[PDB]
Amino acid sequence: SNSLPSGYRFNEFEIQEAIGEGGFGIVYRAYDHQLERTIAIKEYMPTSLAKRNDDLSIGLRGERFGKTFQAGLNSFIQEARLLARFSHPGLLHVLRFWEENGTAYMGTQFYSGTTLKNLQAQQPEKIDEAWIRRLLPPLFSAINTIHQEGYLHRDISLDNIQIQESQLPVLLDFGSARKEIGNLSDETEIVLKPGFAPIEQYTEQGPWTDIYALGAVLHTLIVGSPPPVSVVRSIEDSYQPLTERRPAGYSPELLRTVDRALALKPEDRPQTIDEMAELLE
Ligand SMILES: Nc1ncnc2c1ncn2[C@@H]1O[C@H](COP(=O)(O)OP(=O)(O)CP(=O)(O)O)[C@@H](O)[C@H]1O
């Protein structure tokens, strides 16, 4: 692990545990001793470009990586600024941002529960049609809130949706720094998510782009895996409609909503979150 130790201090903040460690950042449970509350701290840390020094700052693995490391850092800052535009229960709430240790940190609300990806892996039996229909209103609301301010998410999958102990969802991360590093480094495999990204993301985009990814999430919950990669579909569409599979315990109404969200061409999908929600009625 490259993570700061339990007990490390950022003035009033104390690290408690590294709870997430991926290729591009570390997430810590932390504590604010001034306000006496638990928070999360997200630390930019691209492992392919940087390493942990003895004094616990971050340093480049090679001088040639500096330009890309800085561009990822700038994208991390821009994503924090985007999330700071909102005060919505389904969007990661940003408390503070600062630079230190050669990198940057976001202090955020700490959420109960775990990711949808982990829930689907650990407790698939909890995920049925009734549970999905309770998930959708607050998830629709969070995504639509982004859209109404003129932005798109563009990185939806199961990995970045938190399911709280209340079952309410939170969008945690837009992948901005990861995707910028991938574009600049020609590491194409870290930019789009296969099976979740629709055809128009491979090179126009709008609310329908996030709608397709949401359909791909729902498809994964219902049958266990995402639909075929969208470029492959654009050559020979092997997607078989869920209305035709008939997985046990799922209504044609929910199944056709997923199928419509997964229409290959943007114009054939629901055009807004509101349009997709109407399909379930
Ligand atoms: N604000 C927040 N509050 C609580 N948990 C958060 C959070 N932001 C991110 N997380 C958690 O951080 C983790 C980030 O995922 P990541 O893939 O980087 O780490 P990981 O694989 O080491 C642990 P996991 O098995 O959950 O994925 C997820 O478990 C997510 O639930």
Side-chain angles (χ1 to χ4, degrees):
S1 179
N2 296 133
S3 61
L4 295 171
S6 184
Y8 188 94
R9 301 292 295 251
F10 291 104
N11 293 316
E12 80 264 26
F13 292 146
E14 183 168 347
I15 298 294
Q16 300 190 330
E17 185 181 7
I19 60 175
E21 184 159 16
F24 305 86
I26 304 170
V27 181
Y28 303 92
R29 186 179 72 253
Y31 190 71
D32 179 343
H33 288 282
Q34 280 277 24
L35 291 174
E36 296 185 351
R37 69 164 168 209
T38 303
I39 65 166
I41 293 174
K42 201 315 149 345
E43 175 182 38
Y44 173 68
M45 219 307 288
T47 61
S48 70
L49 313 172
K51 47 190 215 184
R52 183 76 61 181
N53 294 324
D54 279 6
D55 72 353
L56 308 187
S57 56
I58 296 306
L60 298 177
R61 285 187 174 276
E63 301 299 288
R64 66 193 187 281
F65 295 138
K67 184 200 180 301
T68 298
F69 178 97
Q70 285 299 312
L73 185 54
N74 292 345
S75 293
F76 184 89
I77 297 166
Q78 291 305 121
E79 180 168 324
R81 287 169 173 173
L82 172 54
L83 283 162
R85 294 180 64 78
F86 304 104
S87 296
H88 186 285
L91 298 175
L92 178 88
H93 201 64
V94 186
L95 302 174
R96 197 205 161 194
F97 190 94
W98 74 102
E99 292 186 66
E100 192 173 335
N101 286 326
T103 188
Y105 298 87
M106 302 171 60
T108 77
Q109 186 164 331
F110 177 81
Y111 299 97
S112 66
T114 191
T115 62
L116 186 55
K117 169 177 148 132
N118 287 343
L119 190 62
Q120 168 78 339
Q122 296 156 10
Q123 304 170 230
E125 71 281 352
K126 186 186 209 168
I127 300 188
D128 58 17
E129 171 153 357
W131 188 91
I132 289 173
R133 283 179 181 265
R134 292 190 295 272
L135 168 69
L136 282 169
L139 183 54
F140 283 153
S141 179
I143 299 169
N144 199 45
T145 296
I146 298 171
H147 293 170
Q148 296 314 314
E149 223 68 2
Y151 294 88
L152 300 180
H153 187 302
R154 285 189 251 208
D155 200 42
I156 290 169
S157 73
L158 287 71
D159 299 21
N160 57 2
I161 303 173
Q162 186 83 354
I163 302 304
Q164 294 165 279
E165 279 145 42
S166 64
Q167 308 304 288
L168 291 173
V170 183
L171 303 178
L172 295 171
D173 195 89
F174 300 151
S176 304
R178 182 196 87 230
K179 295 169 65 158
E180 178 79 342
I181 294 165
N183 277 312
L184 290 173
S185 311
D186 292 327
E187 293 171 332
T188 310
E189 71 275 6
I190 71 178
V191 181
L192 302 177
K193 292 173 168 178
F196 299 87
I199 186 64
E200 72 273 14
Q201 264 186 295
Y202 285 82
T203 180
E204 173 142 39
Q205 302 175 23
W208 50 86
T209 302
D210 289 330
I211 283 155
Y212 183 99
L214 177 58
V217 171
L218 296 173
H219 186 280
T220 304
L221 296 181
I222 291 168
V223 301
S225 55
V229 171
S230 70
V231 168
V232 178
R233 294 185 63 188
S234 75
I235 300 154
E236 174 93 285
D237 193 355
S238 71
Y239 178 68
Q240 188 227 76
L242 293 181
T243 52
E244 292 168 23
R245 293 187 66 156
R246 306 167 163 58
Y250 287 96
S251 69
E253 189 173 60
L254 173 57
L255 297 179
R256 95 173 49 95
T257 301
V258 178
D259 291 335
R260 297 265 215 98
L262 289 170
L264 180 64
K265 298 185 292 214
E267 62 266 28
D268 296 331
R269 295 177 221 150
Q271 297 295 296
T272 70
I273 287 288
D274 282 340
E275 288 187 18
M276 183 177 177
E278 278 207 357
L279 288 178
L280 287 163
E281 170 136 302

